[PDB]
Enzyme design. Sequence first.
Site, PDB file in Angstrom:
ATOM      1  N   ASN A   1      -2.177  -0.583  12.070  1.00 36.29           N
ATOM      2  CA  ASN A   1      -3.028  -1.390  12.924  1.00 36.29           C
ATOM      3  C   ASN A   1      -4.502  -1.355  12.509  1.00 36.29           C
ATOM      4  OD1 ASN A   1      -4.472   0.763  14.429  1.00 36.29           O
ATOM      5  ND2 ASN A   1      -2.459   1.233  15.316  1.00 36.29           N
TER       6      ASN A   1
ATOM      7  N   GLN B   1       3.605   1.488   2.974  1.00 36.43           N
ATOM      8  CA  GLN B   1       3.229   0.501   3.976  1.00 36.43           C
ATOM      9  C   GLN B   1       3.564  -0.915   3.505  1.00 36.43           C
ATOM     10  OE1 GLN B   1      -0.659   0.995   5.717  1.00 36.43           O
ATOM     11  NE2 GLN B   1      -0.933  -1.197   6.174  1.00 36.43           N
TER      12      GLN B   1
ATOM     13  N   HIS C   1      -1.243   5.383  16.383  1.00 36.49           N
ATOM     14  CA  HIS C   1      -0.205   4.504  15.809  1.00 36.49           C
ATOM     15  C   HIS C   1       1.105   4.734  16.549  1.00 36.49           C
ATOM     16  CE1 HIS C   1      -2.604   3.171  12.277  1.00 36.49           C
ATOM     17  NE2 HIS C   1      -3.240   4.299  12.542  1.00 36.49           N
TER      18      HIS C   1
ATOM     19  N   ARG D   1       0.869  -1.185   0.000  1.00 37.29           N
ATOM     20  CA  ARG D   1       0.000   0.000   0.000  1.00 37.29           C
ATOM     21  C   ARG D   1       0.894   1.219   0.000  1.00 37.29           C
ATOM     22  NH1 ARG D   1      -3.117   2.543   5.166  1.00 37.29           N
ATOM     23  NH2 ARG D   1      -4.667   3.858   4.085  1.00 37.29           N
TER      24      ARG D   1
ATOM     25  N   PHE E   1       1.903  10.779   1.503  1.00 37.80           N
ATOM     26  CA  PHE E   1       1.388  10.267   2.747  1.00 37.80           C
ATOM     27  C   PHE E   1       2.371   9.266   3.351  1.00 37.80           C
ATOM     28  CE2 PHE E   1      -2.388   7.638   4.759  1.00 37.80           C
ATOM     29  CZ  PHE E   1      -1.849   7.868   6.035  1.00 37.80           C
TER      30      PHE E   1
ATOM     31  N   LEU F   1      -2.410  10.872  12.929  1.00 39.59           N
ATOM     32  CA  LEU F   1      -2.137   9.493  13.396  1.00 39.59           C
ATOM     33  C   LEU F   1      -1.628   9.440  14.839  1.00 39.59           C
ATOM     34  CD1 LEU F   1      -0.376   7.974  10.251  1.00 39.59           C
ATOM     35  CD2 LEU F   1      -2.789   7.940  10.821  1.00 39.59           C
TER      36      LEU F   1
ATOM     37  N   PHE G   1       4.499   1.277   8.533  1.00 42.36           N
ATOM     38  CA  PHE G   1       4.647   2.258   7.455  1.00 42.36           C
ATOM     39  C   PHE G   1       5.808   3.221   7.732  1.00 42.36           C
ATOM     40  CE2 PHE G   1       1.476   3.732  10.480  1.00 42.36           C
ATOM     41  CZ  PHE G   1       1.666   5.129  10.588  1.00 42.36           C
TER      42      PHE G   1
END
Length: 172
Positions: free
Chosen positions: A111, A73, A135, A65, A70, A131, A122
Amino acid sequence: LYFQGNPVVYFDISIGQTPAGRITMELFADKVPITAENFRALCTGEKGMGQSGKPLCYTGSFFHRIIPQFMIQGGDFTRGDGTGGESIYGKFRDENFVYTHDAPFLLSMANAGPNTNGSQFFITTVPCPWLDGKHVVFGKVLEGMEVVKSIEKCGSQNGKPTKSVCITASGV
């Protein structure tokens, strides 16, 4: 090998059939030991086989991903698609939120809600304050920021990689 008292690990990366180079990372073992150690051991593969029947190792897994502007991942070595992965503890707790997503090139845990850390992680490519407190941030890239940027270029708005991005070796 250590940097400022903390363990250093690496990924070698390929993009398509082409080697893209190495990412080296500092893991914040001093302040985030549980999460740092999971990541360290999954880089080396030293724990052997997981409950899933797959090796507890990042080598051979993909960045599945990738969202430009951004993050990138990976870490799903059980299902390859963002549904799988497993920790060296066989999921684990959010141990703390000492660090925030205040800069690019930070390592943080993917998660599925509170206390569901596995192996998916990531590397941020922008600050990600939205986040914070959800995270666990546990390390940062030391060298290979350009390799991270190369991976980021293989992403899409919908997160689908446009090229196969593979961790071809990992460890200390």
